[PDB]
Design a protein around this ligand. Structure first.
Ligand SMILES: [Cl-]
Lengths: 217, 214
């Protein structure tokens, strides 16, 4: 009778879903887990989510929905009022391709499990592990800047003049440049669009720094 | 006609190749040699700034990249057997399973990452491969748990019809052979993978049956 999300303040995947829920006007409650303190591995949570996935979304009766892109499409197909994809198939594919530059090629390389594995498996200090994270960000940001700057499809937003899944993924990476201290001077098109997206109430309300567990700044 | 810049070993190219065959879409594949640095030539960076495969040209217009986006494009613009169910919960489940591979697992073992680990940290190949192995095992454990215990699984990942979930699953499964990952602990994954492999459209698209393979 109300959507329930299990999330985390910092998670880019949780942020994407949170934005979509807000943009579409879907009432929900979010439960915040500490992913650094191993809440995702606790048996009581595992009782409702065996593989421990965050974010996890419960939409009334049914098993939970996981994986941020799959969830975004689920919301698109079940709540159609404010569409977050265009209608034309090539435009949809481009928007999804841009989203996946982030959600497939970039973000999975900097999740907490990877950060901890690099340190624990190789004995790398945090300072050296972060070289992997920074490289992921920079590689992704370079691709997005080139594509957004040179391709005809870009408008006010990543694809045309309507917010799409591409923008939700883009802003989720952009906020990470703040959280993880990546220089963004070289990506002015990414900046312009990210600020355009961040100016929206639905996006700002969902910002990691406005969630429980966040640091001050 | 459809034209794909591909590679024999690429899991992402394999996903797309399977869909083309299943849906009765003819294609030309250009096989890049990624050991030889074909992905890094200007011509190709022009096509894909990411320096990666696959890239798909569908007539005129710009190339399409990202295997999941391409799979949905093929679903939406072509006829041929559906590779997603009709009901949104089922579609979301299929996509989620696909994304365990395509988001959480596969991006950790692509060539650019293997090369970065060796070059940036000076890791020997054998030590770099621990990162690759950990990715496979992590994804395989997640898939085994989900597929074995969730009600949605049938003959295939989602119900009894092949979907995007299976194309991604088998793209991981074939890598267990190529990269030498033990699979004894994932019997449900094995069952479904061999079910999918039995389909001639999938068997034709197998990495080891592509030009450039050993
Ligand atoms: Cl999952």
């Amino acid at each position: 009778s109300m959507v329930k999300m299990y999330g985390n303040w910092r998670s880019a995947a949780a942020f994407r879903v949170r934005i979509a829920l807000n943009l579409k006007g879907i009432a929900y409650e979010e439960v915040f887990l500490d992913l650094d303190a191993g809440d995702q591995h606790k048996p009581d949570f595992l009782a409702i989510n065996p593989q421990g996935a965050v974010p996890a979304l419960f939409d009334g009766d049914g098993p939970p929905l996981t994986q941020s892109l799959a969830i975004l499409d689920y919301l698109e197909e079940t709540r159609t009022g404010v569409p977050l994809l265009p209608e034309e198939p090539r435009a949809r594919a481009r928007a999804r391709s841009l989203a996946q530059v982030v959600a497939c090629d970039t973000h999975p390389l900097y999740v907490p499990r990877v950060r901890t594995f690099l340190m624990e498996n190789y004995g790398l200090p945090r300072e050296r592990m972060l070289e992997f994270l920074r490289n992921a960000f920079i590689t992704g940001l370079k691709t997005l800047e080139t594509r957004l700057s040179n391709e005809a499809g870009t408008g006010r937003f990543c694809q045309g003049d309507a917010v799409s899944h591409a923008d939700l993924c883009l802003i989720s990476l952009w906020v990470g440049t703040g959280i993880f201290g990546i220089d963004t001077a070289a990506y002015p098109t990414v900046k312009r669009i990210s600020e355009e997206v961040l100016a929206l109430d639905a996006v700002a309300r969902a910002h990691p720094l406005r969630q429980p567990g966040a640091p001050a700044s």
